[PDB]
Amino acid sequence: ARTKQ
Amino acid sequence: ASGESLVGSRIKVWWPMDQAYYKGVVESYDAAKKKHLVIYDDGDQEILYLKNQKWSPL
């Protein structure tokens, strides 16, 4: 998904 | 502020999932697909439709 974490 | 004129600009792009802005530069624009290539500070890259993105210059 579009997350850094 | 979209389109080919944005190339070369430093922008910050909103990632909703992180509730965060991430800084990058617009390296190119694909006219036919209306896509901007953003290269981020941290080494990430995204091909984006900026019109459906929250983002800002500076």
Range of the domain at B58: 1-58
- Are B16 and A2 in contact (CB < 8 Å)? yes
Structure-token match 């430093």, residue found: B10
Decide: B2 and B50 in contact? Cβ < 8 Å: yes
Decide: B26 and B11 in contact? Cβ < 8 Å: yes
List the single best residue of B12, B13, B14, B17 to mutate versus A (max A Cβ within 10 A).
Answer: B17
Structure tokens at B10: 């430093």
The structural domain count of chain B equals: 1
- For residue B41, with 0-12 CB atoms within 10 Å meaning exposed, 13-18 middle and 19 or more buried, which class applies? exposed
Method: X-ray
The resolution in angstroms reads: 1.7
- Residue in B24, B20, B22, B18 with CA at minimum distance from that of residue B36: B24
β-strand partners of B19 = none
- Helix, strand, coil shares, percent, chain B, to 5: 10, 50, 40
CA distance B29 to B43: 19
